[PDB]
Amino acid sequence: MVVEHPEFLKAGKEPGLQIWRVEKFDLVPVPTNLYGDFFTGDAYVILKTVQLRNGNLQYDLHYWLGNECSQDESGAAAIFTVQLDDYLNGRAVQHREVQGFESATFLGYFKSGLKYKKGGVASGFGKPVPDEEPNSTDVEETLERIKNNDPKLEEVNLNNIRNIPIPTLKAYAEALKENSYVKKFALANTRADDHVAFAIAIMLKANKTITSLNLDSNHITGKGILAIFRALLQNNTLTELRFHNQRHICGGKTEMEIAKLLKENTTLLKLGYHFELAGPRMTVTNLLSRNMDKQRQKRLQEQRQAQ
Amino acid sequence: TTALVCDNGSGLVKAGFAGDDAPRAVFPSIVGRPRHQGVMVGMGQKDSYVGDEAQSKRGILTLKYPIEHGIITNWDDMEKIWHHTFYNELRVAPEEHPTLLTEAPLNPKANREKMTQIMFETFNVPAMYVAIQAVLSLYASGRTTGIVLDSGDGVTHNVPIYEGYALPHAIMRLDLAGRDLTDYLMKILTERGYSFVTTAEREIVRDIKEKLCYVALDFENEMATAASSSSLEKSYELPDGQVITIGNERFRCPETLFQPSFIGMESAGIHETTYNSIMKCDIDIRKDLYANNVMSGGTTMYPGIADRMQKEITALAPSTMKIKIIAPPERKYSVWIGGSILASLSTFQQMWITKQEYDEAGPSIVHRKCF
Ligand SMILES: Nc1ncnc2c1ncn2[C@@H]1O[C@H](COP(=O)(O)OP(=O)(O)OP(=O)(O)O)[C@@H](O)[C@H]1O
Ligand SMILES: [Ca+2]
Ligand SMILES: [Ca+2]
Ligand SMILES: [Ca+2]
């Protein structure tokens, strides 16, 4: 939109001269008997309105910059010039006037002549490295807890845990299958692989609860990745998925298949991955952006109810 | 109450509070993750390190930049960065502050939306705005009309602006910027016999660049000078204490900006693309573009670069034309300062996209409220 403000509303009503001074990020009128006396430590916006035969108004906007004026003030003049011009529907011509270099037209506006006075209102302007605190989750204990459907477990973080056996990771997936309490599951940097990814994919067809899964920094490959993304065809719960930093990058036909596979997913809102190719990278970004806006469409028809 | 300003570039986040003359936080825009091949139990439960933290640990991490050539490419790490900025750096509750963000000039439509999506859905900001970087830099210089050369760590742009707005058809773009220039200085120094490949060797080359490099006024003269004497050589002290001499590499590195062939780019030089950009504009604004050339961003810091631009643009422009290059001293931060001012203006409360506006109209709202 376009800005209103009380001086905007008085601006360019009729032939004449208006002069404002930038004061602490606001536009303030210069008293009409002070016109032509310009503090060299300040910045000004000047509007020259002329009558046209039609009865409409010709505008000229000049912004006057004092040599000692501070950066915010002069930056503010230039911007105020722009907003004022916009507000007038772009019909004003913009002139930059610096002290000592001013236009003859500008100077011609003061019959009595232009004075500089020193001074003005004051500016509106006003480590460690590698190791801390290993991950203490007990894998066994936790795996157990998932089987029994423990409602105290809403979060499972295996991140950075070294030396977990693959069939145990596989077992976690098998265990998460009917769980109704685990919304989050982070295995980053576990040396997990495609078998683990396959298991997880199977899991995701049945599982209605987990919203967030983190595979970062693993050995998963394109067939692991992809297997998960086909699975997500049957899954409307998972909103977030992160595979950053696998040991070997999948290549383009994998990135392509990802962006393809996700076309029919209405659900996932976030994908951690670094796409090498911009084409899929963009496609995926548009899809996630569509899915996210549906969550706003609901939310609105939700909001559109309470009367 | 107070407004936040975030200027997210390819190498550096500049972030802070509107009204301040300077950003409170300036840090590497990166997200680290454990390197294969490697170790660490030190990470505890974390999938990643962000910002300064990750820079520390660069040894044991593989670093990744969410912004590439000034454009957002990895969105999940962009959220991270944004989150770190709010909570860990500015230490604020983002749902309490109007938030101004910046973007590259030609940023694709859908990215402008996505940035709008995330700010409202994930951070729940009461209101937000997205401004073009170069445009803010022009404003910070106290101008509505001008053509900005903006060159950072990731991308270099030529952005003509008239009575407050960029002219997109005339914008020119070059992928070459500081990071590429560092890699280029590593080479030719190496071809001189100093061998920098190391994760912490690059670190030193970067220092040499920001310290000893400069732009030659005339390249073949400077090369003829350097060939017939040592007047252009400068001594440089490494951390091992060794003091070595470096030659014409001083200006062959930044010459890449005017001669992108040097690194293998088929692209014309920033001087030629400046002229082109102006030439793509309406004749009647050209004289005002020629007379206001404003430089922005840290890759414009090289001593000599203004004067080199004056000369090349003079050799291109008509005989008559008044040509001036403005190189503000604070121009590593121009973009940020320009936003700081704009978001601080009394007139600004009406420019925000509100949460409510977003909730009702959806993210395409930003194409109609932000030019
Ligand atoms: N004194 C210097 N001389 C040359 N280059 C410099 C100097 N100081 C910083 N740089 C470079 O400036 C860059 C940082 O500038 P800036 O923060 O404007 O870039 P950015 O916004 O991260 O990048 P981009 O604008 O491309 O997205 C880095 O490449 C750094 O090497
Ligand atoms: Ca002042
Ligand atoms: Ca106009
Ligand atoms: Ca930048």
Numbering used by the authors:
A (entry chain G): 1 to 126, 1171 to 1229, 1365 to 1486
B (entry chain A): 5 to 375
Provide the authors' own sentences about this structure as they appear in the paper:
Tropomodulins (Tmods) constitute a conserved family of four isoforms that work in conjunction with one of several tropomyosin (TM) isoforms to cap the pointed end of actin filaments in cytoskeletal structures characterized by their uniform distribution of the lengths of actin filaments. Leiomodins (Lmods) are related to Tmods, and constitute a subfamily of three isoforms: Lmod1, expressed preferentially in differentiated smooth muscle cells; and Lmod2 and Lmod3, expressed more abundantly in skeletal and cardiac muscles. Lmods are distinguished from Tmods by the presence of a C-terminal extension, featuring a proline-rich region and a WH2 domain. We show that ABS2, and not the C-terminal extension, is the main factor distinguishing Lmods and Tmods as filament nucleators and pointed-end-capping proteins, respectively.
However, crystals were only obtained for the 1:1 complex. Overall, the structure is very similar to that of Tmod1ABS2-actin. Second, the ascending loops of the LRR domain have different sequence in Lmod compared with Tmod. These loops bind in the groove formed at the interface between three actin subunits of the filament. In contrast to Tmod1ABS2, all the ABS2 constructs with nucleation activity bound two actin subunits with either LatB or GS1. Invariably, the first binding site had nanomolar affinity, whereas the affinity of the second site was in the micromolar range.
